[PDB]
Amino acid sequence: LLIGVATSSLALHAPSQIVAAIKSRADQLGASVVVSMVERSGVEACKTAVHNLLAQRVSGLIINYPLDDQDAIAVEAACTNVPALFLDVSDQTPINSIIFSHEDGTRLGVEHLVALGHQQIALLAGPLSSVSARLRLAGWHKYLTRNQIQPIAEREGDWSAMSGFQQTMQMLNEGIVPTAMLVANDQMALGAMRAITESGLRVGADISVVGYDDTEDSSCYIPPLTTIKQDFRLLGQTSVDRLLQLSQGQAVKGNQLLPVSLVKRKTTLAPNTQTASPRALADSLMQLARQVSRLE
Amino acid sequence: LLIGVATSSLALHAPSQIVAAIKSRADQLGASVVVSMVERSGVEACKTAVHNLLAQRVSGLIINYPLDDQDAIAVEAACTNVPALFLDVSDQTPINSIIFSHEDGTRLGVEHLVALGHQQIALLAGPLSSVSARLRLAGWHKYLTRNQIQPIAEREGDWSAMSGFQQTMQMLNEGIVPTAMLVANDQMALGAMRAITESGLRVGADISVVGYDDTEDSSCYIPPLTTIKQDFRLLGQTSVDRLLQLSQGQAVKGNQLLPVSLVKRKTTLAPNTQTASPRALADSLMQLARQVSRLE
Amino acid sequence: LLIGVATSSLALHAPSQIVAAIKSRADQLGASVVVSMVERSGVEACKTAVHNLLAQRVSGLIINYPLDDQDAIAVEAACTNVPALFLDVSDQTPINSIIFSHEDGTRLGVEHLVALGHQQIALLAGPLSSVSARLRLAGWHKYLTRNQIQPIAEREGDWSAMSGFQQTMQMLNEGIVPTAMLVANDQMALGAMRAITESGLRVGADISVVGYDDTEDSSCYIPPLTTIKQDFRLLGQTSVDRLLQLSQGQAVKGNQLLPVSLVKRKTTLAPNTQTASPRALADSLMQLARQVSRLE
Amino acid sequence: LLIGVATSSLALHAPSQIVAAIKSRADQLGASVVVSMVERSGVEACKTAVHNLLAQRVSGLIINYPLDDQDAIAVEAACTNVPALFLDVSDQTPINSIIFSHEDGTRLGVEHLVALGHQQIALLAGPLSSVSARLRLAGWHKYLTRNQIQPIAEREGDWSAMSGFQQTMQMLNEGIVPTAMLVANDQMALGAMRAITESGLRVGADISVVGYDDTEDSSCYIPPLTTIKQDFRLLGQTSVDRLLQLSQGQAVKGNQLLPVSLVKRKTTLAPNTQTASPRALADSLMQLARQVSRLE
């Protein structure tokens, strides 16, 4: 029948790619997706959509929206019969979740830099208002502090490439210069790198970066991103499918975790490979001088 | 009070930003929004999404998906009375379509590079199976031949960054070196930029790149992107606004054309052949100075 | 005797200085001041401060707190029975208040920049949750639109020096380089100045700045800041006296505007930036180049 | 419940930041703060302030004011039945005190100037009526003389910037030119910086300056200041936290010494030409760049 989705209200790549995916599995099964957008931020925001969908004679809610444990439980209580699958909650909460692995995404990342030798790492998290955002953060710690490393810089962006740009800009001007950054999403990485680059730094060779999501543009960032990929095509499938087993089968309740993996691209290198430029920056000042004279 | 939206399934940036704008205005004017995603298969798929929208008892429709005139005429028909505003057809198409000036954006893109002094212009458009991606291509022509120049090479991506990277690497790896490329959208320009930088070509100073759209991430594209900005918020207000009025008859029929703008950033410079410029030489220095800060 | 003061518990200097002057004038009169502090919320945070206060059996109340018109009416009523004088509200309110003229402050700042020939002016607003900041920006405008000028920058800070830095820096990175900025307080002005300076620009010559408070430090900011002086001492004496007479039966009640002025210092100059930049730029780059390499 | 505070009615940066950090913690605990202000006077103004807080019927007392020998002891004596916790006396004080390490603070500052290679050190001490001002100067000396160094000159300011400025201008027009100055507070270090800059000297490269406190603004002073950070956020919490213990019943007595650090920023460097300075040079290339930029 009709599967309803509650999602962003902001055009973020990860939430969009998962919708595109849900809508994609629905086709191969002859099912109809009817999407509802959740008013910017909140609890009573998801509720209105869950009312809106249950209303549109749907048969299964895929809550593609961030809710802290109490809220999630407070929203599945709203979807009455219409079974629900929470795609963004904690894998500890009492609903039918289907979360991506944060113990591993964080471990795989925290682990890559370290084996490369990095000990001066910085953390760039998404709004801590977001559960997944938070969990991603706790993981960062758990593992850095379990590999004997306490982060030199810990910031909070809002998923945007520009808050990723801004945040690294401010961090490097506060004086903190990590050899590696652990970023909570792929767009703040576009930004952290625009930040890193326009400082004289070389992403990888000077300041490394590992994103999270491996969203579509990522392979094409102008130093392609080493990321923690979260297969949204597989997520969309796995979910449409478990959703149907809630109503049209036996709700084998609990939470399922999808795997995650490190996509080694071109933004991570061992620290202090170092080129800082001695008579070299002089060399350059000198080359622009003659151009500067050629000017006037 | 229920805008029904037929939107693409493709997870491209521009259309999701438009959806966020249409829904923001939903929230503001008291109305509701229900989305039905069109798989990329013409009106056949579009009109079915129209049926499902029309089945949830939507007040009116916003069909935001590329309809080929004659397809547009048909999607419309299947919106049985219910008012339909078209966000992606031809202004030259006899239906109710609000459309960004395909004539302005292509003039500004061309006019920008001619004034900088480029004569060797390469064109990279989206999939010719799109009126916007045909109306854009025709547009680069009117003004290239007008300002007396024919495109040295022209390719076709699919709106994604990978297609930009590849087409440009092909043109580039085929012997063709343009000084400025006029790219259809912003995601694809992300990739032009990468094919440019991986061939030892500095985007901007060697091969300038002009995008189109100005999708939220564009300003953090490392060399921030110069682009034809198309305001998607304005689409969110004019469409929702007009949809509600439309829905209540009021003879404001046919196409309405919207403003465009050149958001100039760091990807367009005077060609490989000038000097550098007081503009390009000031930037060169400040990154050198910034390195001199850390240097010693 | 006892005059209870309800104040901002965030340590911004301007309000510290008013509480200080109330302590100063209550001392002259043989009176005691008791400061209750307000959490960062709205009216219920100021209201409870009134109850914390009222309870101490105070005879008058001075609300040194940004109330949003209607909320001033609410606190005015919570702390009734006892005479209440509001110091950070709008002159439009049906309460006893003592505000500093915003029309002047905003004109004086907008006019000194104009007589000097500034055309590209930027605006640094305080958090618009503040009725004061909210009012400073309106005039920046009223006098700028009445002088043929439109701001080419409109940013908001939270009053700290660091938010002043981030916003001036963000704007210069966005590409906007105004000849003068009209800042809303001296702290953001310090940061704006620290921003302009680390960009290679000159406070005064390349970018003038006009703060707004004439806080104690302003005299010693690197380029001694030219500000709109708000005399918190005259404010502390008049507010105390007016409360002690309201304490009695002496009305003369409603809204009362204290004057304000423009303290010329060093940050203001004309945009007569000597455009000289002779072929001397090259030779001078040259020396800096040798200079750079000498220590490496 | 209620904690009364006897603070300085002079509006200084740090004392205002503690009173805030006291409010913050008092908040988290369900404690209600009432502030009384102390006009500078011996044990006198403080005894009457104590009385006002006793009249207000408070649970405990936090005395945040510069109390001398038997001043602290008399003010304690008048604090009948309410426990008094002092924030500004000495160690060698038989009262419940809690202040930052002056042995550590002055040691780190000094030995930071001695590791960079200076020997010509200046002192801009605070007003000698403050116990900590005189403790801070004791420490400048103790460690100055243990590193075989002896200050070339020393000054007394009154904690404001205008005084640092004058005390610093005075010594500079007296022939005494130090390679570094150790200053009692950042507000005082601000004017010393104005003083140095105006005498044609480059703060940091000519006269390194080390403040003490790290009040909010410092991170944004022109050359951002190197300071002995004193965390008022902990003084505020430990004070309120301990204050209630002493009256809860867990009699936790005597003085407690909170740790301190040095925040290295941009006002300290080594003194020299075979230094030629990296930030000095860098500030110059961006000034040059911002001069080439306007070459059109």
PDB file of C-alpha atoms in Angstrom, chain B residues 69-156:
ATOM      1  CA  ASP B  69       6.238  20.896 -23.568  1.00  0.00           C
ATOM      2  CA  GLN B  70       4.043  18.242 -25.040  1.00  0.00           C
ATOM      3  CA  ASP B  71       4.578  16.211 -21.830  1.00  0.00           C
ATOM      4  CA  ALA B  72       3.788  19.264 -19.761  1.00  0.00           C
ATOM      5  CA  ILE B  73       0.495  19.654 -21.657  1.00  0.00           C
ATOM      6  CA  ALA B  74      -0.377  16.050 -20.640  1.00  0.00           C
ATOM      7  CA  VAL B  75       0.733  16.132 -17.014  1.00  0.00           C
ATOM      8  CA  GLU B  76      -1.443  19.171 -16.732  1.00  0.00           C
ATOM      9  CA  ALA B  77      -4.531  17.431 -18.188  1.00  0.00           C
ATOM     10  CA  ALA B  78      -4.273  14.691 -15.530  1.00  0.00           C
ATOM     11  CA  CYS B  79      -4.579  17.410 -12.826  1.00  0.00           C
ATOM     12  CA  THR B  80      -8.303  17.067 -13.273  1.00  0.00           C
ATOM     13  CA  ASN B  81      -9.473  20.673 -12.408  1.00  0.00           C
ATOM     14  CA  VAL B  82      -7.039  20.943  -9.551  1.00  0.00           C
ATOM     15  CA  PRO B  83      -4.705  23.951 -10.224  1.00  0.00           C
ATOM     16  CA  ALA B  84      -1.203  23.107 -11.465  1.00  0.00           C
ATOM     17  CA  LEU B  85       1.822  25.382 -11.329  1.00  0.00           C
ATOM     18  CA  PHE B  86       4.843  24.138 -13.334  1.00  0.00           C
ATOM     19  CA  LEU B  87       8.347  24.853 -12.042  1.00  0.00           C
ATOM     20  CA  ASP B  88      10.357  23.163 -14.798  1.00  0.00           C
ATOM     21  CA  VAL B  89       8.936  23.502 -18.303  1.00  0.00           C
ATOM     22  CA  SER B  90       9.282  26.087 -21.016  1.00  0.00           C
ATOM     23  CA  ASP B  91       8.131  29.644 -20.357  1.00  0.00           C
ATOM     24  CA  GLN B  92       7.451  29.111 -24.010  1.00  0.00           C
ATOM     25  CA  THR B  93       4.945  26.391 -22.891  1.00  0.00           C
ATOM     26  CA  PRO B  94       1.124  27.123 -22.868  1.00  0.00           C
ATOM     27  CA  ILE B  95       0.549  25.945 -19.187  1.00  0.00           C
ATOM     28  CA  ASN B  96       0.761  27.638 -15.735  1.00  0.00           C
ATOM     29  CA  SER B  97       4.538  27.700 -15.293  1.00  0.00           C
ATOM     30  CA  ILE B  98       6.644  29.968 -13.050  1.00  0.00           C
ATOM     31  CA  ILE B  99      10.207  29.880 -14.531  1.00  0.00           C
ATOM     32  CA  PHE B 100      13.701  31.357 -13.836  1.00  0.00           C
ATOM     33  CA  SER B 101      14.860  33.523 -16.758  1.00  0.00           C
ATOM     34  CA  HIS B 102      16.667  31.045 -18.978  1.00  0.00           C
ATOM     35  CA  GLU B 103      17.491  34.095 -21.094  1.00  0.00           C
ATOM     36  CA  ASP B 104      19.138  36.231 -18.354  1.00  0.00           C
ATOM     37  CA  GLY B 105      21.278  33.513 -16.771  1.00  0.00           C
ATOM     38  CA  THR B 106      22.845  32.483 -20.039  1.00  0.00           C
ATOM     39  CA  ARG B 107      23.527  36.113 -20.981  1.00  0.00           C
ATOM     40  CA  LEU B 108      25.175  36.820 -17.709  1.00  0.00           C
ATOM     41  CA  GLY B 109      27.212  33.631 -17.868  1.00  0.00           C
ATOM     42  CA  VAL B 110      28.414  34.426 -21.374  1.00  0.00           C
ATOM     43  CA  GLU B 111      28.718  38.215 -20.846  1.00  0.00           C
ATOM     44  CA  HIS B 112      30.818  37.604 -17.745  1.00  0.00           C
ATOM     45  CA  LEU B 113      33.586  35.707 -19.513  1.00  0.00           C
ATOM     46  CA  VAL B 114      33.658  37.875 -22.596  1.00  0.00           C
ATOM     47  CA  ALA B 115      34.245  41.004 -20.490  1.00  0.00           C
ATOM     48  CA  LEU B 116      37.079  39.145 -18.652  1.00  0.00           C
ATOM     49  CA  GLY B 117      38.605  38.543 -22.079  1.00  0.00           C
ATOM     50  CA  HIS B 118      38.051  34.853 -22.745  1.00  0.00           C
ATOM     51  CA  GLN B 119      37.581  33.789 -26.344  1.00  0.00           C
ATOM     52  CA  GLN B 120      38.018  30.035 -25.914  1.00  0.00           C
ATOM     53  CA  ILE B 121      34.740  28.991 -24.259  1.00  0.00           C
ATOM     54  CA  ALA B 122      33.836  25.313 -23.554  1.00  0.00           C
ATOM     55  CA  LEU B 123      30.184  24.449 -22.697  1.00  0.00           C
ATOM     56  CA  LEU B 124      29.068  21.632 -20.332  1.00  0.00           C
ATOM     57  CA  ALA B 125      25.301  21.179 -20.121  1.00  0.00           C
ATOM     58  CA  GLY B 126      23.150  18.788 -18.166  1.00  0.00           C
ATOM     59  CA  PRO B 127      21.135  15.995 -19.889  1.00  0.00           C
ATOM     60  CA  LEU B 128      19.506  17.258 -23.085  1.00  0.00           C
ATOM     61  CA  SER B 129      16.421  15.423 -21.832  1.00  0.00           C
ATOM     62  CA  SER B 130      15.444  18.477 -19.887  1.00  0.00           C
ATOM     63  CA  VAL B 131      13.982  21.716 -21.140  1.00  0.00           C
ATOM     64  CA  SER B 132      16.169  23.662 -18.720  1.00  0.00           C
ATOM     65  CA  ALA B 133      19.174  21.728 -20.023  1.00  0.00           C
ATOM     66  CA  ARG B 134      18.210  22.605 -23.556  1.00  0.00           C
ATOM     67  CA  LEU B 135      17.040  26.144 -22.923  1.00  0.00           C
ATOM     68  CA  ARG B 136      20.390  26.735 -21.190  1.00  0.00           C
ATOM     69  CA  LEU B 137      22.399  25.284 -24.077  1.00  0.00           C
ATOM     70  CA  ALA B 138      20.527  27.304 -26.666  1.00  0.00           C
ATOM     71  CA  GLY B 139      21.183  30.296 -24.442  1.00  0.00           C
ATOM     72  CA  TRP B 140      24.995  29.890 -24.286  1.00  0.00           C
ATOM     73  CA  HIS B 141      24.750  29.946 -28.071  1.00  0.00           C
ATOM     74  CA  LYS B 142      22.736  33.096 -28.742  1.00  0.00           C
ATOM     75  CA  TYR B 143      25.399  35.122 -26.840  1.00  0.00           C
ATOM     76  CA  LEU B 144      28.483  33.256 -27.775  1.00  0.00           C
ATOM     77  CA  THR B 145      27.712  33.764 -31.455  1.00  0.00           C
ATOM     78  CA  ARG B 146      26.395  37.235 -30.537  1.00  0.00           C
ATOM     79  CA  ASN B 147      29.595  38.274 -28.853  1.00  0.00           C
ATOM     80  CA  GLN B 148      31.127  36.676 -31.906  1.00  0.00           C
ATOM     81  CA  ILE B 149      32.378  33.329 -30.619  1.00  0.00           C
ATOM     82  CA  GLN B 150      31.523  29.705 -31.194  1.00  0.00           C
ATOM     83  CA  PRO B 151      32.014  27.150 -28.399  1.00  0.00           C
ATOM     84  CA  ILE B 152      35.262  25.245 -28.862  1.00  0.00           C
ATOM     85  CA  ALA B 153      33.772  22.019 -27.414  1.00  0.00           C
ATOM     86  CA  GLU B 154      30.614  21.109 -25.670  1.00  0.00           C
ATOM     87  CA  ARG B 155      29.691  18.095 -23.551  1.00  0.00           C
ATOM     88  CA  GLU B 156      26.809  16.681 -21.524  1.00  0.00           C
TER      89      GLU B 156
END
